[PDB]
Amino acid sequence: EPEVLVEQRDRILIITINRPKAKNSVNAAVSRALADAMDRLDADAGLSVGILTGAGGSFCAGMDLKAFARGENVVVEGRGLGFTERPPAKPLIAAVEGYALAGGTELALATDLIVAARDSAFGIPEVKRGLVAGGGGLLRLPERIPYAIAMELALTGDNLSAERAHALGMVNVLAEPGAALDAAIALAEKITANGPLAVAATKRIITESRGWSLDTRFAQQMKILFPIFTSNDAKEGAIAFAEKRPPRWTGT
Amino acid sequence: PEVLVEQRDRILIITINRPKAKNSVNAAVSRALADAMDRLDADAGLSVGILTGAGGSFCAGMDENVVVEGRGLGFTERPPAKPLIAAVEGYALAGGTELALATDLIVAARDSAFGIPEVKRGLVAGGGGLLRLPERIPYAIAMELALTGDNLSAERAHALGMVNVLAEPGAALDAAIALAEKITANGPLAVAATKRIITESRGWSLDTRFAQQMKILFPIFTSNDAKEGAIAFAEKRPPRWTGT
Amino acid sequence: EPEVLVEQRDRILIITINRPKAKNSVNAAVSRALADAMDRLDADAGLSVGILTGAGGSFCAGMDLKAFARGENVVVEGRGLGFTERPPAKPLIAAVEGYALAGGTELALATDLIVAARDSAFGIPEVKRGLVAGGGGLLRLPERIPYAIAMELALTGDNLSAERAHALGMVNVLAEPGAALDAAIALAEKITANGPLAVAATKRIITESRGWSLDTRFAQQMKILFPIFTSNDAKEGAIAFAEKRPPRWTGT
């Protein structure tokens, strides 16, 4: 059985970490296959949105430390844990059941949107074992929830419940336990109904803009806006609306 | 006149005045907005601006040279130096949301709504909504709103810390004036320096931030208002500022 | 009678501003003794976490204006108001009773975590007196709570209650009035149970990462992670977890 399963439903790619006996921990096989799945997602013109999930009712207990200690290529150059260091250009949704701990919280945080079972949990317990979270949890956590609560979780290693992460605005949608994938699919479909060149460019600006100075950010944004103004989709969106009918996207 | 301007002691009230087009921005509006922000920043007897729209709507979005270079849609690309409060009624969608975000403080009717629907129509929000929404509410909720194009209610924007004040429908301007009055009561230079530091510090490195700040602090130490504030407090009486 | 009390309780350094008379405001003696205590915290191998508090029902009323006016060296070069310009490497917790105003709010913000009494208050009223908060409150407050609320508070000068600062995510823990210090100690102890090199690097990464670009952040982080991989504590964490017993940390 593949250590990561990949399935297309319409224009959504569903990516499932499949080591439920190892609590979906990330070895080199998972890390390469996540990497390849994101490549696939970005390259395939028939796809609009990715969804990341774990098999068997749990998202991911983190990095496979045994595999790392033995020497597998778990943290891939320019990619990290699967894609922690190079997320995909297209929208990516985490669908979380059970535990998303350590590297697993890091994978969730590397996505754009999180849908989490009401009974699921996150955390970076690394320090409790004399480790440090190095898959970007320490870079992204303080950017998703209040700085001091991120600090607190990082230094204590305490769990952060899905409901608390939703209250703090880290988790976008709370689902019925067992129903996270379905809710993430519903969310993915809303995004998929939108203009794909506009969606991608919109994600890029949100993401990159934190690195842009006050003085330069409008000009940097404009370089990304520039192909939108003359895109076929931009003209279609206006035509359809004025024709009072649904839009038809081509990604051009 | 497609934009009204009034002075109320140290407050400037700037009213988009085209309710027929749901207060959408044309070149007259845009140029007059920019004109009013410059007026706000020039007069040392003004401390705070308020931006509102006439007749139960704030601004519907973009309506012809509407986007003044170096300034944007009225002021989206160079907001004023001084504090600016949006007073929101009805729909503030698309470019109207961007106008609201370009202000510092948002006072909104409890029945008003925000949103950046641009992607639904194969467009991208270019007036700063994508730059500012993620600064104002949690990053992932901003991402969600941007990619889906869904509305964000005034009550939810208030819960997320983007709307400073919920007001009764029809009363957003009055609440905005009360908020402005709480600010015009404070030292004019110290208020202005306070906004400047908060704004610019976003872009200062940890190793330079205090020295960068000290440059702004410097004339406050010797300002007449600093002495007046000290004199007024011991004397247990209200301060009489001069903006020097 | 000394103006800053410093007490060790096991691995916790407790630092008490001791000028209840002057509402624990910072003159040059308090300022230098705060810096000395932060130096002691970082230098002492038997120390893991600091707690900053104020004697007598109040945290700190801010800079001592009478001291500043008579020309005392209150704002120490390279340190600021005690440590506002140079916080310590080890974790630091503010334990807040009564008022933490003006420079007092800025002291609390220069810590990593805030434990506040349910009836305590924060704020930066400077502008009401024609002054400007120069101890970092204008730098840090918009990093702790929603940006436009930070903006609002700085311009109006309004108090922010402990309950509101907690709802906003600035205060980590609400304590019983009069028992802020004990709740800070319990929080310190959770952090003290964790691996000291790992905790120190964790705080470091969270703090510094705010200034690293997207395309350099993982490499800058790696520089800090590097000695964690081969530290004796990472090994001790594994062995202690293997043997199902408390880890015995060495800081190596």
Query: Of the residues C106, C152, C163, C243, which is catalytic?
Result: C106
Resolution to 1 decimal place, in Å:
2.2
SS3 (DSSP) at A160: strand
Q: Are residues B143 and B114 in the same domain?
A: yes
The backbone region for A116, taken as left when phi is positive above 0, alpha when psi lies in -120 to 50, beta otherwise, is beta
What count of Cα atoms within 13 Å lies in the side-chain half-sphere of residue B37?
Answer: 26
Instruction: List all chains that touch chain C, counting a touch as 3 or more CB pairs closer than 8 Å.
Output: A, B
Q: How far apart are CA A57 and CA A68, in angstroms?
A: 24
Residues of B in contact with C142 (CB under 8 A): 198, 201-202
Exposed e or buried b for every residue in C205-236, given b needs 16+ CB within 10 A?
bbbbbeebeeeebbebbeebbeebeebebbeb
CB within 8 Å of chain B, chain A residues 87-106: 91
Distance from the Cα of A87 to chain C's closest Cα (Å) equals: 12
C54 φ, ψ (degrees, to nearest 5): -125, 140
Alpha-carbon distances of B231 from B187, B219, C71, C129, C134, rounded to whole Å:
13, 18, 18, 9, 21
SS3 (DSSP) at C32: helix
Q: How far apart are CA B200 and CA B209, in angstroms?
A: 9
Alpha-carbon distances of A146 from B137, B160, C172, C191, rounded to whole Å:
11, 12, 10, 19
Q: Label each residue of A107-158 as H, E or C.
A: HHHHCCEEEEECCCEEECCHHHHCCCCCCCHHHHHHHHCCHHHHHHHHHHCC
Say if B187 is an interface residue toward chain A (CB within 8 Å).
no
Which CATH number covers residue A21? 3.90.226.10
Instruction: List all chains that touch chain A, counting a touch as 3 or more CB pairs closer than 8 Å.
Output: B, C
B77 a catalytic residue = no
Contacts of A229 (CB under 8 A, 6+ apart): none
Among A164, A194, A224, give the residue marking a domain's end: A194
Q: Are residues B234 and B148 in the same domain?
A: no
Q: Are residues A114 and A202 in the same domain?
A: no
The two three-digit tokens of residue B206, written as one number: 């940890």
CB within 8 Å of chain C, chain A residues 14-73: 65, 69
Query: Of the residues A1, A72, A97, A106, which is catalytic?
Result: A106
Say if A206 is an interface residue toward chain B (CB within 8 Å).
yes
Q: Are residues A88 and A28 in the same domain?
A: yes
C157 φ, ψ (degrees, to nearest 5): 80, 15
For residue A100, which of A170, A151, A39, A13 has the smallest C-alpha distance?
Answer: A170
Block residue for tokens 């609002």: C152
Pairing outcome for strands C99-101 and C113-117: unpaired
Q: Are residues B58 and B1 in the same domain?
A: yes
Pairing outcome for strands A80-81 and A75-76: antiparallel
Block residue for tokens 């509101």: C164
Instruction: List all chains that touch chain B, counting a touch as 3 or more CB pairs closer than 8 Å.
Output: A, C
Distance from the Cα of C71 to chain A's closest Cα (Å) equals: 35
Element (DSSP H or E) covering residue C213: none
Q: How many domains would you assign to chain A?
A: 2
Report the sign of the C-alpha dihedral through residues A64, A68, A72, A75, in that order. Answer: positive
Asked if residues A157 and A130 have their Cβ atoms less than 8 Å apart, the reply is no
Query: Of the residues C85, C126, C163, C176, which is catalytic?
Result: C126
Q: Are residues A47 and A154 in the same domain?
A: yes
Q: Are residues A123 and A142 in the same domain?
A: yes
Among A194, A218, A233, give the residue marking a domain's end: A194
Alpha-carbon distances of B161 from B130, B186, B200, C45, C157, rounded to whole Å:
17, 23, 20, 42, 18
Terminal CA-to-CA distance of chain A, rounded, Å?
Answer: 38
Report the sign of the C-alpha dihedral through residues A47, A53, A54, A60, in that order. Answer: positive
Contacts of A126 (CB under 8 A, 6+ apart): A102, A132, A133, A157, C198, C202
Q: Do A211 and C210 touch (CB under 8 A)?
A: no
Contacts of C132 (CB under 8 A, 6+ apart): B190, B193, B194, B197, B216, B217, B220, C126, C138
Asked if residues A168 and C169 have their Cβ atoms less than 8 Å apart, the reply is yes
Q: Are residues A101 and A190 in the same domain?
A: yes
Q: How far apart are CA A102 and CA A62, in angstroms?
A: 5
SS3 content of chain B, % helix, strand, coil (to 5): 45, 20, 40
Q: Are residues B182 and B203 in the same domain?
A: no
Contacts of B177 (CB under 8 A, 6+ apart): B8, B11, B13, B50
Query: Of the residues B118, B135, B200, B235, which is catalytic?
Result: B118
Q: Do B223 and C130 touch (CB under 8 A)?
A: yes
Say if C150 is an interface residue toward chain B (CB within 8 Å).
yes
Say if C131 is an interface residue toward chain A (CB within 8 Å).
no
Sheet architecture: strand order including C49-54: C4-9, C12-17, C49-54, C92-96, C113-117, C173-175
Please give the biggest Cα pair distance in chain B: 62
The two three-digit tokens of residue B116, written as one number: 């950046």
Residues of A in contact with C248 (CB under 8 A): none
What count of Cα atoms within 13 Å lies in the side-chain half-sphere of residue A84?
Answer: 32
* Method used to determine the 3D structure: X-ray
Q: Are residues A136 and A230 in the same domain?
A: no
Which of A132, A140, A159, A204 is the best mutation test for C, with the most CBs of C within 10 A? A132
**Total beta-carbon pairs less than 8 A apart between chain A and chain C:** 116
Structural domain span for residue A3: 1-194
Say if C168 is an interface residue toward chain B (CB within 8 Å).
yes
Among A179, A194, A209, give the residue marking a domain's end: A194
Torsion, CA B120, CA B124, CA B126, CA B129, rounded to 10: 60
Asked if residues A183 and A115 have their Cβ atoms less than 8 Å apart, the reply is yes
Neighbours of C73 (CB within 10 A): 12
Which of C64, C79, C106, C129 is the best mutation test for B, with the most CBs of B within 10 A? C129
SS3 (DSSP) at A93: strand
A72 a catalytic residue = no
Say if B154 is an interface residue toward chain C (CB within 8 Å).
no
Q: Are residues B115 and B210 in the same domain?
A: no
Which CATH number covers residue A209? 1.10.12.10
Terminal CA-to-CA distance of chain B, rounded, Å?
Answer: 34
Q: How far apart are CA A19 and CA A26, in angstroms?
A: 9
Q: How far apart are CA C186 and CA B112, in angstroms?
A: 44
Asked if residues C86 and B209 have their Cβ atoms less than 8 Å apart, the reply is no
Sheet architecture: strand order including B11-16: B3-8, B11-16, B48-53, B84-88, B105-109, B165-167
Alpha carbon of residue A89 to chain centroid = 11
Q: Are residues C139 and C109 in the same domain?
A: yes
Q: Do A198 and B126 touch (CB under 8 A)?
A: no
The two three-digit tokens of residue C69, written as one number: 């006016």
Discontinuities after residues in chain B (C–N over 2.5 A): 63
Number of helices (H) and strands (E), helices first, in chain A? Answer: 10, 11
Q: How far apart are CA A158 and CA C172, in angstroms?
A: 13
SS3 (DSSP) at B6: strand
